[PDB]
């Protein structure tokens, strides 16, 4: 279970983002460049109807491939339905829209084996305010792996 952005203005998360940091409940979800949930968000695209398209990069067949996940709005605020990366939900935890956004993905069937969270930033500075916000949010969650990236890796295909 989770603590979410219940006042989320979906339209204001539009545009460019970089993955600064990631955390997962299970080491195996992030423990290699090919791990199923090691994904790098490039862009969030709200639809006119309040759905969300997430553009990301993922090492696949020995290439940095572009993926688009379609996230459909639900009757619960800040919770979107997906069918991707063996996940079925996206939760937005916290954002100021202009600097940082924290979100998680999970399988509702097995959240403690599926839970992956990301710190997104608007610009490739090692955002210590963003990392601090992510730290505060992860305080609550049962995370056993935490990864961070340097400014340089944010602007690279699939973070080097
Ligand atoms: Pt909030």
Residue numbers in the entry: 3 to 162
Q: Which passages does the manuscript contain on this structure?
A:
pmcβ-lactoglobulin is a whey carrier protein of 18.4 kDa. Due to its high water solubility, safe status, biodegradable nature, gel-forming ability, abundance, stability at an acidic pH, and stability against gastric pepsin, β-lactoglobulin can be considered a good protein for the preparation of micro- or nano-particles in the pharmaceutical and food industries, although it is one of the major allergens in cows’ milk. Since the protein binds anticancer Pt compounds, it can, in principle, be used as a nanocarrier with controlled release properties for these molecules. Spectroscopic and spectrometric measurements suggested that β-lactoglobulin can also bind oxaliplatin (OXA), a Pt-based anticancer agent that is approved for the treatment of colorectal cancer.
Crystals of OXA/β-lactoglobulin adduct were obtained using soaking experiments: crystals of the ligand-free protein, grown using a hanging-drop vapor-diffusion method with a reservoir solution containing 35% pentaerythritol propoxylate, 0.2 M KCl, and 0.04 M HEPES at pH 7.5 (protein concentration: 30 mg mL−1), were soaked for 3 days in a solution of the reservoir with OXA. Analysis of the X-ray diffraction pattern indicated that β-lactoglobulin crystals grown under this condition belong to a new crystal form. The final structure contained two molecules in the asymmetric unit (molecules A and B hereafter) and was refined to an R-factor of 0.212 (R-free = 0.284) (see SI for further details). An inspection of the difference using Fourier and anomalous electron-density maps clearly reveals the presence of a peak due to the binding of a Pt-containing fragment close to the side chain of Met7 of molecule A, in agreement with what is observed in the structure of the adduct formed when crystals of the protein have been treated with CDDP. Access to the side chain of Met7 of molecule B is hampered by the crystal lattice. The Pt center coordinates the S atom of the side chain of Met (SD atom) with a Pt-SD distance of 2.48 Å. Ligands of Pt are not well defined. Mass spectrometry data suggest that OXA rapidly binds the protein via the coordination of a [Pt(DACH)]2+ fragment to a β-lactoglobulin residue side chain. Since the Pt binding to the Met side chain could be reversible, our data suggest that β-lactoglobulin could be used as a Pt-based drug delivery system.
